[PDB]
Ligand binder design. Sequence first.
Ligand SMILES: N[C@@H]1[C@@H](O)[C@H](O)[C@@H](COP(=O)(O)O)O[C@@H]1O
Ligand SMILES: [Mg+2]
Length: 90
Amino acid sequence: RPNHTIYINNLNEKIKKDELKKSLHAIFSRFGQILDILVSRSLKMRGQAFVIFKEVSSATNALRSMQGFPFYDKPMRIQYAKTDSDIIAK
RNA sequence: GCGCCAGAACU
RNA sequence: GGCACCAUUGCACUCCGGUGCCAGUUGACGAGGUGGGGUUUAUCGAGAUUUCGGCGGAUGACUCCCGGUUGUUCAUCACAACCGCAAGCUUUUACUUAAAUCAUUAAGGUGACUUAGUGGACAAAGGUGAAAGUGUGAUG
Ligand SMILES: N[C@@H]1[C@@H](O)[C@H](O)[C@@H](COP(=O)(O)O)O[C@@H]1O
Ligand SMILES: [Mg+2]
């Protein structure tokens, strides 16, 4: 269902860890205040990002507005997080 | 036990 | 660590896919040490994944010299150890800021690491102060 964290995939893998993290904050800041954006370049986690919002309302607005948006020459694919994040759950 | 850095090791 | 190529469209919350090329970083912690030449593997502990390995230096050692000093009064010689502004040797102590490692804290770096601090200390060789026993022979 809905979640404080949104799962993003289909991201450009050629972009380094912190540059992506800062460019993602550049867009998702308008929907609500972001707690953290978790990015990893491992085989299992590359081209993926976890933006953690404080409110669920900010996650839904981000999911609705940024879906299919071209980001680094690639259209974004946004879902909700399957489970809560460690900053939200604990 | 003083200086350097084509190996080696580490990132 | 970058960069390139290949593989990868996944649901994470501590650093984790291959392959090449190209960089970067470390790389001796103090204590002590220089009459001239020759030869050489250049003293002492502390620490310990590299204080490894390679290059350069080097006050060491050995040996032949030059010049001294001691060899328990003096001098000339040979002989032994010793000094090189010091000086026979065995034998005891104390003193001569140990520093780094270790433990941490800040600053810088993507990182390996770098710089600067702080804390606790811990040597040996040499040298010196003082305490014990002995130094070669022949001689004008
Ligand atoms: N004091 C040291 C010597 O003890 C050592 O013999 C020399 C050579 O260094 P290495 O150990 O690299 O041969 O360097 C220094 O001079
Ligand atoms: Mg040094």
